[PDB]
């Protein structure tokens, strides 16, 4: 390794760096938290009451199992185009809330649905934050929501004063003032219902189709999470380079004992440097302390090297005798 | 897959309360409602009762506002009805259905139905 | 309350034609509200479609369902001659209610 570090076939003599040594995991440990429930996603994709796109629905998950599996792999009618997670590797995460909106979306604005995005229903009907997360899924729904004269119980709005906030619903019944009337309710010309009906066709091919679209907003903050996946927990190993999958805070290092004091509400630790240092067992409620396994620098001692073919490694950082981690005892 | 079993057929007289109930397996008993309809000779199908899981939601019918009352217990994944003020008239055989229908968790109407039944009670 | 309409009373049909069942509502009803169960001698309900056209276990060669907005009707082809069930639609939107009855008899 002297000689291909640096390149050259005689090295002279002195002292130089090889590489560095580091031992290697010999185990995996997964231990997520207690719970059975399984998640009623078949409540909001198989739902029959989807409202209008200018007032959608705010909906909650709490605490269950949730097979990502069947969102993907069964059903796959329509391209998903996640924003921020890969599906397959959906499974090991596991969060902390989950919400699910639904509204109902002309064909030709399938697109619209973005980060950042602009539009006529991008700014006045939903806007997405820049920094969203999750999936967005969107299916073909010609023959449930559509009339042979067309529906105009589906309504967007056109007109509103200002653009809305994201994640922002602003239903309201008004007129709206423009030029120079000042209609009080009056409703003249220049004073323009906002609320336009849908009006659709199921004569007409792609472009005016009727399109159902559910999207998920997930977010990864440190809390008790809640919702959680199918992977199957297993037991504790102490005093071994191990790795670890507490609550989806993957990384590997020694888990040992801990004399910290962690109040109820606790559940992290972090050190001066910002980092995981103590992470309380979720089915125990114990505390422990997170330490990466052990490393160092390595050094090759020789003299000149037409004079001799020996060596002396120097292991650095590292205590002989606890850690004497192949020339190795020798 | 689907287990659903019941318990046996007896004879009740009028004006007791008699005792059903609806053990399930093969399914996790948390996402899903149950039902409880009654079949007699010479007609269809009734209607009785709708029942939560994840909570305690209860959807019994206009015709037996009051008469029937139904129970669920996770820890031996069994439904029981206490039906009281018994008839001469209503003794039938009563299903325990899965239900695919309304919400679980939250309430909404769905698509779909009884897609898991049981043997039935006969009273 | 809702009821619904029913009159494909009898069915006095040979084995393997065309079969078609046809029940109508009281009220308009969405599209998504629709099912059929089969009732053998002495045994327990189960689904046909839970939708439309939307197939629930199997359905070989003989189940088919096509619903026209408010009212929907039953497409069977090749009927083989051993189920002969009592046939019963199901809407969903307003409350809940039965199929009325539908027969197949052997004619001796």
């Known amino acids: 390794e002297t000689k291909c570090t640096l390149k050259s076939f005689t090295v002279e003599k002195g002292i130089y760096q090889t590489s560095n040594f580091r031992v290697q995991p010999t185990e995996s440990i997964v231990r997520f938290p207690n719970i059975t429930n399984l998640c009623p996603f078949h409540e909001v994709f198989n739902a029959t009451r989807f409202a209008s796109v200018y007032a959608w629905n705010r909906k909650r998950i709490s605490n269950c199992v949730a097979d990502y599996s069947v969102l993907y792999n069964f059903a796959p009618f329509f391209a998903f185009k996640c924003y921020g997670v890969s599906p397959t590797k959906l499974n090991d995460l596991c969060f902390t809330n989950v919400y699910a909106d639904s509204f109902v979306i002309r064909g030709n604005e399938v697109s619209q649905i973005a980060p950042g995005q602009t539009g006529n229903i991008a700014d006045y009907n939903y806007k997405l934050p820049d920094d969203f997360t999750g999936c967005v899924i969107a299916w073909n729904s010609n023959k449930l929501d559509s009339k042979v004269s067309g529906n105009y119980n589906y309504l967007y709005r056109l007109f509103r004063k200002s653009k809305l906030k994201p994640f922002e619903r602003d239903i309201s019944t008004e007129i709206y003032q423009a030029g120079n009337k000042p209609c009080n309710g009056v409703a003249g010309f220049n004073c323009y219902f906002p609320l336009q009906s849908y009006g659709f066709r199921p004569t007409y091919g792609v472009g005016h189709q009727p399109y159902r679209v559910v999207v998920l907003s997930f977010e990864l903050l440190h809390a008790p999470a809640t919702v959680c996946g199918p992977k199957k927990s297993t037991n504790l190993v102490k005093n071994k380079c191990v790795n670890f999958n507490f609550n989806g805070l993957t990384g590997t290092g020694v888990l040992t004992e801990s004399n910290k004091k962690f109040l109820p509400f606790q559940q992290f630790g972090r050190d001066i440097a910002d980092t995981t240092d103590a992470v309380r067992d979720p089915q125990t409620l114990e505390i422990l302390d997170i330490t990466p396994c052990s490393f160092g620098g390595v050094s090759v001692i020789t003299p000149g090297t037409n004079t001799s073919n020996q060596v002396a490694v120097l292991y650095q950082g590292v205590n002989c005798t606890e850690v004497p981690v192949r020339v190795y005892s020798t | 897959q689907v287990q659903l079993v019941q318990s046996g057929a007896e004879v009740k007289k009028p004006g007791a309360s008699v005792k059903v109930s609806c053990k399930a397996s093969?399914?996790?008993?948390?996402?899903?409602?149950i039902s409880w309809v009654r079949q007699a000779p010479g007609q269809g199908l009734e209607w009785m009762g709708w029942?939560?899981?994840?909570?305690?939601?209860?959807n019994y019918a206009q015709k037996f506002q009051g008469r029937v009352t139904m129970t669920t217990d996770t820890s031996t994944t069994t439904g029981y009805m206490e039906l009281r003020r018994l008839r001469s008239d209503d003794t039938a055989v009563y299903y325990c259905?899965?239900?695919?229908?309304?919400?679980?968790?939250?309430?909404?109407?769905?698509?779909?139905?009884?897609?898991?039944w049981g043997q039935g009670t006969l009273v | 309350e809702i009821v619904l309409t029913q009159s494909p009373g009898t069915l006095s049909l040979s084995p393997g034609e065309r079969a078609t069942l046809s029940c109508r509502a009281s009220?308009?009803?969405?599209?998504?509200?629709l099912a059929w169960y089969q009732q053998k001698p002495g045994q327990a309900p189960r689904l046909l479609i839970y939708?439309?056209?939307s197939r629930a276990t199997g359905i070989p060669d003989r189940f088919s369902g096509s619903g026209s907005g408010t009212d929907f009707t039953l497409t069977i082809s090749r009927l083989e001659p051993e189920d002969f069930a009592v046939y019963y639609c199901?809407?969903?939107?307003?409350?809940?209610?039965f199929g009325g009855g539908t027969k197949v008899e052997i004619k001796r």
């Open positions: 259905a899965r239900d695919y229908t309304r919400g679980a968790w939250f309430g909404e109407s769905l698509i779909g139905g009884f897609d898991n």
């Open positions: 029942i939560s899981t994840y909570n305690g939601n209860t």
């Open positions: 199901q809407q969903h939107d307003t409350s809940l209610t």
């Open positions: 093969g399914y996790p008993f948390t996402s899903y409602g």
């Open positions: 939708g439309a056209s």
């Open positions: 009220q308009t009803v969405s599209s998504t509200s």
